[PDB]
Ligand binder design. Structure first.
Ligand SMILES: CCC1=C(C)/C(=C/C2=NC(=C\c3[nH]c(/C=C4\NC(=O)[C@H](C)[C@H]4CC)c(C)c3CCC(=O)O)/C(CCC(=O)O)=C2C)NC1=O
Ligand SMILES: CCC1=C(C)/C(=C/C2=NC(=C\c3[nH]c(/C=C4\NC(=O)[C@H](C)[C@H]4CC)c(C)c3CCC(=O)O)/C(CCC(=O)O)=C2C)NC1=O
Ligand SMILES: CCC1=C(C)/C(=C/C2=NC(=C\c3[nH]c(/C=C4\NC(=O)[C@H](C)[C@H]4CC)c(C)c3CCC(=O)O)/C(CCC(=O)O)=C2C)NC1=O
Ligand SMILES: CCC1=C(C)/C(=C/C2=NC(=C\c3[nH]c(/C=C4\NC(=O)[C@H](C)[C@H]4CC)c(C)c3CCC(=O)O)/C(CCC(=O)O)=C2C)NC1=O
Ligand SMILES: CCC1=C(C)/C(=C/C2=NC(=C\c3[nH]c(/C=C4\NC(=O)[C@H](C)[C@H]4CC)c(C)c3CCC(=O)O)/C(CCC(=O)O)=C2C)NC1=O
Ligand SMILES: CCC1=C(C)/C(=C/C2=NC(=C\c3[nH]c(/C=C4\NC(=O)[C@H](C)[C@H]4CC)c(C)c3CCC(=O)O)/C(CCC(=O)O)=C2C)NC1=O
Ligand SMILES: CCC1=C(C)/C(=C/C2=NC(=C\c3[nH]c(/C=C4\NC(=O)[C@H](C)[C@H]4CC)c(C)c3CCC(=O)O)/C(CCC(=O)O)=C2C)NC1=O
Ligand SMILES: CCC1=C(C)/C(=C/C2=NC(=C\c3[nH]c(/C=C4\NC(=O)[C@H](C)[C@H]4CC)c(C)c3CCC(=O)O)/C(CCC(=O)O)=C2C)NC1=O
Lengths: 253, 98, 160, 47, 161, 160, 161, 161, 161, 161, 161
């Protein structure tokens, strides 16, 4: 794109907004009324520091050539250096604040804080993890029972191909057999009168096989055996006996 | 007249899609399949397609069982459908608010 | 990822992350080191885990490898072990992410449709995952095995 | 729609350009492109 | 959508004409093949899942596209593509019953290439899967119904290419 | 068309055509031949049908051709006979389609608005259609006339 | 949206690879800075209104755009623009927590230039207001978190320009 | 929408100005013609159906567009087009009362050419029907109100062409 | 381009009319002011460089836009903007001589806002520089010619905003 | 451009196929009608000026578009439109000789609606002039060649609408 | 175009700054790798034809796109695509020498997706051919230069997708 290239990002300029009370220090009278102080050394007055002093060339002549005595890379930093340039006061530009430094945060290689840490993390996520697992198996039990109770076997379901895959699933997992069609499109049936009549016997009346072959299927009150199922007596129906016609048979209805 | 002129005149139209549309709604005393196919029609309108390719299966199950039992109206099922985690994942996360 | 999910759940409400969400992100980044260690252990013991899970599956479900079963033959058995390796890799992803988003977005959404279209019994896959769970938890400590089986259990629940 | 009907496509006539915008919405397939069909209405003179 | 009858009536109505001998010719042609069309549609509705399964097995089941990096690697993508194939089969059956591919133009092909290009779905593999489905479908329904169905299968493939 | 309407009604529910709808499509394609024959007979006797219907209308409704009536003058009477020919053509379309979709989509939707904007009494058009119905049913057999008047009756009901 | 962890896992998964030493390098890098990220996000959530107020005061509060004829003259427009700045700050915070600007692409920058161009919103003034917000935010959160936040601020400004 | 008064107030407010002599000039101009505008609007509301009927009779009633093949052949299309003409007349009356065509831009012309092009409605015949309606309307309301109404009729025709 | 004479002739010719009393009114109006227009155009041609120099000095010479980061910092940009101001002055002079701003529409304003937006040129500063040029130009040419020139200066500023 | 032979060869070559029985069917069909095509092209070349003159006389010669205000009022516009009609006739003859309308797509219809819309040329009047030219041309060349020519005339009208 | 040095100088100049320690850091970084860059560029210039030949042979040489119906079936298309691959390799080499992908944005990616979409060139196959070229190029130039070149190869693929 070249060298002198305009960017909105790098435009610190009031040209797109017309704030006509802002320019650059020009007159000597501008230091008392409009301008404050340079924010860096590039913006400094020519040949002076950011604070207004004459710039001195920053480095001397090392006395005491010696690796053990004499200043070297191991020498500690004299505290009066930061005092000399005024970096110890909070209103100075070079005032360092270590509370938000990266160095203040905790090391992660330290095993100690790591094991202190993981327990605190598990403590929060335990409840939500358990809740989501409970929800998943709730959904599974619900679909098993509505598979066993006739849902998903109406012919509007058996026409779509995903309904056919669900029927093959229900068959393959031995949950229930869904009567579909023959290869040429005619409805299956065990008694040729009406369509979709399925077989029965010896497994329509067995318990504990509601979701057979489904791994750890918790359906109902799995934590106990079930009541003995006996009520072999007839209660007279008062005002609720189905009144039928005399000397005839209710054909159909 | 020829195939080019006839094809131009047969197509001039809003579209036949406007006439060739059917509405779903609960009438009196529906069975449980009738409720199911209405719920599946809602999933195609709010999600634009059948759900089974972009969900696990346990996300709107309690909403389906509730509508099939006759406990919530069509409007409540659509409201509950629109504020599910499925709707949030498909039509809110990948797009801007506009 | 926990950070991602916190950010979206805070984004829908048009608010910054509350101090609870930030607390939880902090606890997560603090436990990331043992998360990486556990992922290490599960990752580099993959061969034994897949092998021993395949054994327990084939002894518990001899029909799938019986003559004609879905995984019948050398190639089909290799493909089934490939699937088990897929799911072990996803479990390691979920362990490092701190949440089942990687497992669920890859390998759980639409898994029933895929396995029904392939003709594979999903209960057999659930059995294989359970066997791999036992084998993998055998190699961890108490608390580590508890936290690691936390994801196998979710994968089993989603695969009912 | 009331409380009994499922929403549907609804070809509109007199909302002033609701027709072509609705047609573009429903005639596009899911995830067809990244475009936003109605980013805003073009500004009118006034407030 | 317009079927053969609707198309003939439209061609006659767009000229202010009554249905003359050529319209009767086309109408008889459709009425003679309607029963074969119904038979084929029933048989295809019977075996949609097996048709899709066999086409996928013969076309792209063991190729590299189902491998990591392929477009249909994860379970989401596999399920999405088998749903797409189900769409294609169902709409081809509709077109065969109607005797007119206008439903394919209005409900399937409109903006499909652009969606696939934005998603990154390979078009050649899709066309080959549809071609494999054409084989199985013609196989199952016999020669005449297979040619009828292959007409609309090739229509979809040409609209996609 | 019956096929089209069955397809849309099955499409809204997201299901294939049930065996009842396929049964009805089959019965329709089987009767298509006598449908074409009846359309033949009605089509090629159009001049007598329009003429004799126009007579019965003008004798039953002398006001429309009386001095100043809507169809008063040579040109207006010709235009009214043109309209009757339009509706006979639409009835033939409906007979071949097996359903009133062609008649209703062309000539019935918004017919009251059009005839009110033109200043034409819609009851006169209904009378003309009834007269044409009697004339046309006179030329058919018993069952054929019954099936053909089936559409004239719908056109009359829509034109009340 | 994908964070740093999701991006690393995706790069590894798109090649059928296990997480090797470079993935561990990036993951450790994110895990070391996560706590600083949480601190910065908390502090920014604390002072959002004051940050927006100070940025608006230093950038466009007394310029000519707030006078009659300016884009944000009436009260509707002033409120709308401060809401926009709140959006930018919140989404930059999300991006800083995630360590990945993909949320900015998906939820912010997608179709934003076109909306602003149709409305007539000046883009340069918006970019300058975001730059002023970057100053105040880095000021409030300190040097390291300020550089992190400024990364996503500059990302938004580049996507807008 | 903005009328003449709203437009003058906006032009004055967008400069931070008080309403000076030129604004008073325009405001007096509108206030002098307001009563004629109300008279014309009442008369047009009285005879809308007859105006549309006569315009249709003189413009496109016996042409080939009303015959088979033409746009507006069937009864649906005839009713739709007379409803369109009613829309045009009502909105032209609104614009004449307001003394400003901005309502036509916001509520009528926005996306109208594109809708007509997608539907296949002939634009030239529509413009000619609007021109015929302009004749009858100016006829019924007299010279001054007819010129006022014809201003907005021509505005609609220019926005449609 | 069309001047006042061309516009009057076009308005008369587009109706098949001969030039009647109102056309004569407008033509006399232009012919009476033509000599003042020629005087003003000569004086403006005499002092174009000084006009641009003084307008730039009073409008944007010492602002922050000429400082590093401004849009007109480097020498390329300074030269480009003074060339732009020369364009504006020359075309305003053409429009004043012609008595018709159509040349400004055809040769200046067509696609200017879009070019400036793509380049990043601040529109407000440009409008203010044109306003300052209007002051100096009216100053130099006197009251009547200054109002004439300010008409087209304001036309350019309105077309740019 | 591709004629019928080129199109058949391309359809066969794009599949790696040799020319089978269906290609022979189409090729024989073209070869049987080639001589009639040459006769019609010669006759049309003989009477192009009279065809255009008669079509213009029957379609738009005395309408209001030739009067002041109408498109084609001045002599420039009249000459331009008769040149356009000559273009349409010549390219329809090319398409009839080739038996393929691809030359019309490549050399005529590409960007024609946009040019006419930018110029302000009425599309409906143009389509009606082409329809009138179709009448005269079919008249002069007889029934079969007239249907052949009307195919491409209607192709141009559909591409223009 | 701007290289690494130009980009550093621009970043420093756009703030009125002298080149400070960070600029020196980046400049030293570029100067240390320049000699490796020159070596890689020479080696790539040596073997461009063989690189393109091997990439085409491994990526799309025997696929169905080179057969009838495929995009690069005829000899024109084959030559055009190998010329395209030569373009990509040469511009990636330029970008590697410069250490900055701006030349790819200015001279390659600008309007490339739109050209390919108008022509019908498959984007996925192109990206895969570029990926295969990345393999061979990294192979030939060794690990470090291969990573450098793969940076710009992936840049082109991302700009194309
Ligand atoms: C308020 C501004 C506004 C207008 C004007 C408008 C027009 C509009 N006109 C329409 C249709 C139509 N418009 C016409 C009009 C005409 N046919 C002709 O031949 C004539 C030249 C012309 C009448 C002068 C016709 C025939 C249709 C029906 C198209 C169809 O059924 O395919 C439709 C489709 C909606 C529907 O009927 O279902 C809309 C939305 N919408 C608006 O919001
Ligand atoms: C990352 C998530 C993910 C999964 C899980 C996945 C599964 C997947 N399993 C497949 C096959 C298969 N999977 C099995 C698996 C089994 N057979 C049994 O009896 C057992 C119950 C079970 C093993 C535990 C078999 C036998 C096949 C081959 C089926 C065939 O080709 O007929 C295939 C087709 C071929 C291939 O592997 O590329 C896919 C795509 N893809 C994915 O992206
Ligand atoms: C009724 C006409 C119609 C079609 C066909 C249609 C397709 C369609 N296919 C989609 C995705 C898809 N389609 C495929 C398909 C395939 N992958 C392959 O490798 C094969 C070649 C191919 C199957 C043969 C895949 C994998 C996706 C998922 C893309 C993704 O998740 O990124 C999506 C994105 C919606 C979503 O899944 O969230 C749509 C809308 N939409 C329609 O309205
Ligand atoms: C295909 C469906 C369809 C219909 C029905 C139709 C009717 C239609 N009837 C018309 C006129 C007319 N129609 C009549 C009819 C009658 N006068 C009477 O008194 C009787 C009650 C009645 C005859 C039975 C008359 C008199 C006119 C001319 C009205 C006039 O010009 O003033 C016109 C205007 C001129 C024209 O014919 O083009 C149309 C468009 N258009 C259609 O597309
Ligand atoms: C990076 C390349 C570059 C250059 C060189 C540049 C020059 C430049 N010189 C300027 C002024 C000026 N320059 C001078 C310079 C001089 N007077 C003399 O007698 C000497 C011959 C000469 C000094 C050696 C003066 C006096 C002004 C102020 C003129 C005025 O305001 O009247 C100005 C207007 C005010 C400002 O400084 O912002 C610019 C933009 N801009 C650029 O982008
Ligand atoms: C005849 C009508 C007409 C105009 C007006 C026009 C303007 C125009 N101004 C341009 C640039 C420019 N225009 C300016 C102008 C300004 N900078 C500011 O800060 C001020 C507010 C403003 C001057 C008042 C600048 C600085 C550039 C250079 C942009 C760049 O180098 O990136 C360019 C780019 C061409 C080039 O310099 O290479 C064109 C084409 N073109 C035309 O055909
Ligand atoms: C403003 C410039 C301009 C001119 C000049 C113009 C001429 C023009 N002259 C015309 C006809 C005509 N012009 C004439 C003229 C003549 N017959 C003779 O023998 C004489 C030599 C000559 C009279 C001096 C005739 C006879 C017609 C009718 C031709 C016909 O319809 O067959 C027509 C067609 C009908 C109509 O008038 O609308 C036009 C457009 N149009 C324009 O826009
Ligand atoms: C329809 C016009 C047309 C032509 C001609 C064509 C040629 C063509 N020739 C090829 C290869 C080839 N062609 C040859 C041919 C020869 N070796 C010799 O020594 C002989 C001189 C010559 C045989 C007479 C060989 C050996 C290859 C393989 C080169 C390789 O893979 O290294 C390839 C790459 C692989 C492939 O066949 O798909 C193309 C595309 N493509 C076209 O579209």
């Amino acid at each position: 794109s070249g060298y002198g290239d305009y960017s909105y990002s790098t435009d610190r300029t009031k040209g797109h907004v017309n704030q006509y009370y802002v320019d650059k220090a020009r007159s000597r009278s501008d230091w008392g009324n409009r301008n404050v102080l340079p924010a860096s050394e590039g913006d400094a007055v020519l040949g002076r520091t950011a604070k207004g002093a004459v710039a001195v060339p920053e480095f001397g002549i090392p006395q005491l050539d010696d690796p053990v005595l004499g200043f070297g890379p191991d020498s500690m930093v004299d505290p009066r250096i930061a005092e000399a340039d005024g970096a110890v006061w909070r209103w100075d530009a070079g005032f360092v604040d270590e509370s938000m430094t990266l160095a203040s945060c905790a090391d992660i290689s330290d095993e100690a804080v790591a094991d202190e840490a993981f327990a605190k993390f598990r403590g929060s996520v335990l409840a939500e993890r358990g809740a989501m697992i409970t929800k998943a198996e709730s959904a599974t039990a619900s679909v098993i029972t509505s598979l066993r109770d006739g849902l998903y076997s109406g012919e509007a379901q058996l026409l779509t191909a995903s309904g056919q895959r669900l029927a093959n699933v229900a068959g393959q997992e031995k949950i229930a057999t869904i009567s579909g069609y023959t290869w040429d499109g005619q409805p299956q049936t065990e008694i040729p009168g009406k369509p979709f009549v399925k077989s029965i016997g010896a497994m329509d009346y067995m318990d504990g096989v509601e979701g057979g072959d489904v791994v750890a299927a918790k359906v109902g009150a799995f934590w106990k055996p079930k009541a003995p199922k006996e009520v072999p007596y007839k209660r007279p129906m008062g005002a609720n006996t189905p009144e039928l016609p005399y000397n005839t048979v209710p054909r159909l209805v | 007249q020829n195939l080019y002129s006839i094809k131009y005149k047969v197509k001039q139209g809003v579209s036949k899609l406007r006439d060739q549309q059917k509405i779903f709604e609960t009438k009196g005393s529906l069975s449980k399949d009738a409720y199911l196919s209405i719920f599946q029609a809602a999933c195609r309108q709010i999600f634009e397609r059948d759900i089974s390719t972009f969900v696990i299966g346990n996300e709107i199950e309690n909403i389906k069982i509730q509508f099939i039992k006759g406990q919530i109206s069509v409007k409540e099922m659509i409201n509950a459908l629109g504020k599910s985690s499925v709707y949030l994942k498909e039509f809110y996360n990948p797009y801007p608010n506009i | 990822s926990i950070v991602t999910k916190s950010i979206v759940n805070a984004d829908a409400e048009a608010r910054y992350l509350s101090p609870g969400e930030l607390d939880r992100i902090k606890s997560f980044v603090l436990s990331g080191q043992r998360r990486l260690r556990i992922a290490q252990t599960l990752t580099e013991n993959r061969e034994r885990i897949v092998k021993q899970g395949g054994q327990q599956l084939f002894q518990r479900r001899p029909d799938v490898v019986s003559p004609g079963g879905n995984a019948y033959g050398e190639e089909m058995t290799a493909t089934c072990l490939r699937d088990l390796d897929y799911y072990l890799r996803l479990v390691t992803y979920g362990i490092i992410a701190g949440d089942v988003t990687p497992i669920e977005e890859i390998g759980l959404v639409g898994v029933k449709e895929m396995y029904s279209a392939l003709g594979t019994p999903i209960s057999g896959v659930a059995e294989g995952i359970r066997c791999m769970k036992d084998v993998a938890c055998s190699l961890l400590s108490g608390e580590d095995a508890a936290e690691v089986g936390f994801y196998f259990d979710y994968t089993l629940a989603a695969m009912q | 729609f009331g409380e009994v009907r499922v929403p549907f496509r609804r070809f509109p006539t007199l909302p002033a350009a609701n027709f072509p915008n609705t047609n573009t919405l429903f005639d596009k397939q899911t995830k067809q492109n990244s475009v936003v069909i109605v980013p805003s209405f073009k500004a009118i003179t006034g407030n | 959508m317009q079927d053969a009858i609707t198309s003939v009536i439209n061609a006659a109505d767009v000229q202010g004409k009554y249905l003359d001998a050529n319209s009767v010719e086309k109408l008889r042609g459709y009425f003679q093949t309607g029963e074969l069309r119904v038979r084929a549609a029933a048989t295809i509705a019977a075996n949609a899942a097996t048709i899709i399964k066999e086409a996928v097995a013969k076309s792209l089941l063991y190729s590299d596209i189902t491998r990591p990096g392929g477009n249909m690697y994860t379970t989401r993508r596999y399920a999405a593509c088998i749903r797409d194939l189900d769409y294609y089969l169902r709409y081809a059956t509709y077109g065969m019953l109607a005797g007119d591919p206008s439903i394919l133009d209005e409900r399937v092909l409109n903006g499909l290439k652009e969606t696939y290009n934005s998603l990154g779905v390979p078009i050649g593999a899709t066309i080959q899967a549809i071609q494999a489905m054409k084989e199985v479908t013609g196989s199952l329904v016999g020669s005449d119904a297979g040619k009828e169905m292959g007409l609309y299968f090739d229509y979809i493939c040409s609209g996609l290419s």
